[PDB]
């Protein structure tokens, strides 16, 4: 279990197979015209091709914007990457805004990579040679292979390795009766240590003591990692290497954290294209959610509608609560949604409609069902009524304190008097503004 | 393999002839004949590359193909010639000045190509014998034409053992530096599988002569040169963009040494192009520095996109066309892009829907051209992908007019969004 968040109730868009919207499926009620609109871009995302697209969910504050924007992520599943970022995270003190934007852009892009490796494990029993005639003048007989006996919890098996592996063994300095790990594709050998079956009574030598090597002596299992392109970026930018004093600067916070296009193009993209065409990694193009995009400035918008035209960028979902407002960063330039007209003419717009009394009542019911509150039918109607006056946010936030008052007064369901008392103990934006205007 | 089709992925180059005569709808581009011909003239002057520091300004209405012409020039110029695309807002950094960022952007599109004739030895190792007492040994190199033997030295054996090359392996040996590079495994590289082997990727043995003299080329930009010469940390080009090279001998020395190299025939020059999209973001300081940065002999050509008209210059209150001061506007040659007509919008939509692999009906094209002439061509283009998804959802074959109409009613453009913004909407 975990904390109940403000959007823990949404699980999907609840759309029919034909593309139509259901009444209250997947926790989302009403909002058909916008849920279908965003289900269309859900299928766009599923179609990994046709990238470099942007969609702007615009509307009054808090109607359904964030709810359906993150329900897009639930419909898409955790498999595809969905990177959220509020418009206020662009301003940084150690890196530039156009670089934060590029990082988030090619951070939303995922890249899952598969690889199959064979592995060995088991307490070695003994090593012996395979003698053979001299390939050259009679200086002595040579060795062709080395037989090694590995014992595990399943059984004991003998295996043949090449003389190079025996030389690796010699320079590794293992003996008979220790735990070793071998791989055939690479050829490296790892010394795990002594086995627990030979555990000591007193000896204090700590080596992460290897327990009984449970399992077969040979095991093949596929590894499937989920790495993003920004992970590779940061790893190649500040590598955590060994004794390479260029790397020993990890003792610094290292400001000046911007990347370089030379690298970004010539080093990281080639290695990904090679893996994709070879069959080692599958590209998982993703979504970049930007709520409160109105906070971005003119420079951020200009960079946004230059990067969006890139063939590599993921699909972007902006959100807007403002109307005809001034563009931040400029002196006085009023444009719709606080977004410049040049960027607005490049993104698809979806108007999030306003809710009716019945729709807000259904939303309150769903939120009460999610928060585990046993609201009664009278308290629900009163919440609907007093939420038709104010906004939906205040109407639905009066469920935790009402339930607490109920539990304290010895109840198991929110009654009418409880919500009536909470509505008088707490106020909303308009009620508070009225008192503020009445006072000096 | 998988690099999605962006907004500008449909143009593969300017549709020009040998005499720089723009064709109507060839090579992805459509209409815009005058601006395409100007783009071709400047591209020919670029491919010539005996004049440095020339500026062009592609001005025009929003969504008329300015960035399209820029990407077309980039594609027609192809590799082996630096083309750096930058938005005007990308130079506003926190760790380096605007002038330093502009110097970086310029010097990043200037290529220096050192051509070397280092000889090597390419063949398929047959045997690698070595006896440790300094250890001494021999190697048998085979090519399809001949076989030979070599006595391996101390460091030769050291490098061979470090690289772990074995028999049947095809390798190349830089005799000057001794650098080894194994290219693959030959059919002989078969290890007679009787042990933990998991590699069987064979390849043909090298053909030709044993000890051949091939030609290598090392191409690096003046930006990379000065970056790696700045300080002992010769990895800032990948490590991080932490920079600030003083304009002392470092850059002047790069320039002087590249001049001597060009004179002595080591590496002469390959000029480049700098596409500044949305140049109106640059500051008055940026313009004032560019004024004289375009005068340097190591200055590549630049093309600046413009949507603005008579508007104040950023960082001041001076009204100037293109949002650029006349001081800099005087160096530029201005090319104006005109709006697309009905048949041009229709052809652009057709090429775009054929590039993104979406079959539209004859009436779908008509209704989409109507929507794109009443509203923005960009909105009309974005409508195609959205309309194809409803068709695929209903299990159709080609986009009809009803799907495009459903998508138009479902998604809103800027004008209809503004007209729907009838409420306060938290202004």
């Amino acid at each position: 279990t975990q904390r109940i968040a403000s959007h823990s109730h949404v699980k999907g868009l609840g759309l029919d197979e034909s593309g139509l919207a259901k009444q209250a499926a997947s926790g989302l009620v009403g909002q058909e015209n916008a849920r279908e609109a965003c289900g269309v871009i859900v299928e766009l995302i599923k179609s990994k091709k046709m990238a470099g697209r942007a969609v702007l969910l615009a509307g009054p504050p808090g109607t359904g914007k964030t709810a359906l924007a993150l329900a897009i992520a639930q419909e898409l599943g955790s498999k595809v990457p969905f990177c959220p970022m509020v418009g206020s995270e662009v301003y940084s003190t150690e890196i530039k805004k156009t670089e934060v934007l590029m990082e988030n852009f090619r951070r939303a892009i995922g890249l899952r990579i598969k690889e199959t490796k064979e592995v060995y494990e088991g307490e070695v029993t003994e090593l012996t040679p395979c003698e053979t005639e001299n390939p050259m003048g009679g200086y002595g007989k040579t060795i062709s292979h080395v037989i090694i006996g590995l014992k595990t919890a399943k059984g004991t098996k003998q295996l043949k390795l090449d003389p190079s592996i025996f030389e690796s063994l010699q320079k590794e300095r293992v003996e008979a009766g220790d735990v070793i790990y071998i791989e055939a594709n690479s050829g490296a050998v790892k010394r795990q240590g002594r086995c627990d079956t030979y555990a000591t009574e007193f000896d204090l030598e700590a080596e992460e003591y290897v327990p009984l090597p449970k399992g077969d002596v040979h095991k093949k299992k596929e590894i499937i990692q989920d790495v993003t392109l920004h992970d590779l970026d940061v790893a190649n930018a500040r590598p955590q290497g060994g004794q390479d004093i260029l790397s020993m600067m990890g003792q610094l916070m290292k400001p000046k954290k911007t990347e370089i296009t030379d690298k970004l193009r010539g080093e990281i993209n080639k290695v990904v294209n090679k893996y994709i065409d070879q069959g080692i990694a599958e590209l998982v193009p993703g979504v970049l959610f930007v709520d409160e995009v109105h906070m971005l400035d003119i420079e951020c918008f200009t960079y946004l509608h230059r990067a969006l035209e890139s063939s590599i960028a993921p699909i972007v979902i902006f959100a807007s609560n403002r109307g005809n407002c001034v563009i931040r960063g400029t002196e006085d330039i009023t444009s719709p949604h606080g977004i410049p007209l040049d960027l607005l003419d490049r993104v698809m717009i979806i108007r999030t409609m306003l809710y009716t009394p019945q729709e807000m009542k259904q939303i309150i019911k769903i939120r009460a069902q999610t928060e585990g509150i046993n609201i009664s039918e009278e308290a629900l109607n009163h919440l609907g009524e007093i939420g038709t006056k104010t906004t939906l946010r205040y109407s639905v936030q009066l469920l935790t304190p009402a339930n607490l008052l109920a539990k304290i007064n010895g109840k198991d369901s929110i009654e009418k008097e409880h919500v009536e008392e909470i509505s008088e103990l707490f106020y909303d934006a308009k009620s508070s503004a009225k008192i503020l205007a009445d006072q000096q | 393999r998988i690099e999605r089709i962006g907004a500008h992925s449909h143009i593969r180059g300017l549709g020009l002839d040998d005499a720089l005569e723009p064709r109507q709808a060839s090579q992805g581009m459509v209409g815009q004949l005058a601006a395409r011909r100007a783009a071709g003239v400047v591209l020919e002057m670029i491919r010539e590359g005996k004049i440095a520091g020339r500026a062009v300004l592609i001005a025009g209405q929003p969504g008329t193909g300015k960035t399209a012409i820029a990407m077309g020039m980039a594609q027609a110029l192809g590799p082996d010639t630096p083309f750096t695309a930058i938005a005007g807002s990308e130079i506003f950094s926190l760790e380096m000045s605007k002038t330093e960022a502009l110097t970086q952007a310029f010097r990043r599109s200037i290529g220096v190509r050192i051509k070397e004739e280092t000889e090597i030895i390419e063949g398929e190792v047959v045997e690698i014998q070595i006896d440790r007492p300094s250890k001494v040994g021999k190697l048998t190199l085979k090519t399809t034409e001949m076989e030979t033997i070599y006595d391996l030295g101390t460091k030769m054996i050291e490098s061979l053992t470090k690289d772990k090359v074995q028999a049947g392996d095809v390798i190349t040996i830089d005799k000057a530096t001794g650098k080894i590079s194994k290219l693959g495994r030959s059919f002989t590289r078969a290890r007679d599988y009787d042990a933990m082997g998991s590699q069987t990727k064979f390849v043909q043995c090298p053909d030709g002569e044993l000890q051949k003299r091939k030609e290598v080329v090392h191409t690096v930009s003046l930006h990379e040169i000065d970056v790696i010469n700045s300080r002992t940390q010769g990895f800032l080009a990948l490590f991080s963009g932490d920079t600030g090279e003083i304009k002392s001998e470092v850059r002047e020395q790069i320039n002087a040494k590249v001049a001597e190299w060009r004179e002595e025939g080591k590496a002469e020059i390959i000029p480049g192009v700098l596409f500044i999209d949305e140049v109106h973001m640059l500051d008055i300081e940026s313009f004032s520095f560019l004024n004289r940065a375009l005068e340097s002999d190591m200055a590549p050509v630049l093309i600046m996109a413009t949507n603005r008209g008579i508007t104040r210059i950023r960082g001041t209150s001076y009204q100037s066309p293109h949002g650029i001061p006349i001081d800099l506007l005087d160096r530029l040659l201005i090319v104006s892009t005109t709006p697309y007509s009905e048949k041009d919008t229709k052809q652009i939509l057709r090429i775009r829907c054929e590039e993104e692999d979406v079959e539209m009906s004859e009436d779908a094209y008509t209704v989409l051209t109507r929507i794109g002439l009443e509203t923005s061509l960009r909105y009309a283009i974005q409508l195609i992908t959205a309309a194809s998804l409803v068709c695929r959802k209903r299990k159709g074959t080609e986009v009809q007019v009803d799907d495009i109409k459903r998508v138009y009613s479902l998604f809103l453009d800027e004008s209809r969004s503004t007209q729907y913004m009838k409420e306060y909407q938290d202004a």
């Binding site: - | 190792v125 047959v126 006896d131 250890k135 059919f187 078969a190």
Partner: peptide, 13 residues
């Protein structure tokens, strides 16, 4: 005394 010999022959492909 301790003369080692590392070899790698191309058996008859």
């Amino acid at each position: 005394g301790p003369i080692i010999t590392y070899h790698s022959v191309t058996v008859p492909r």
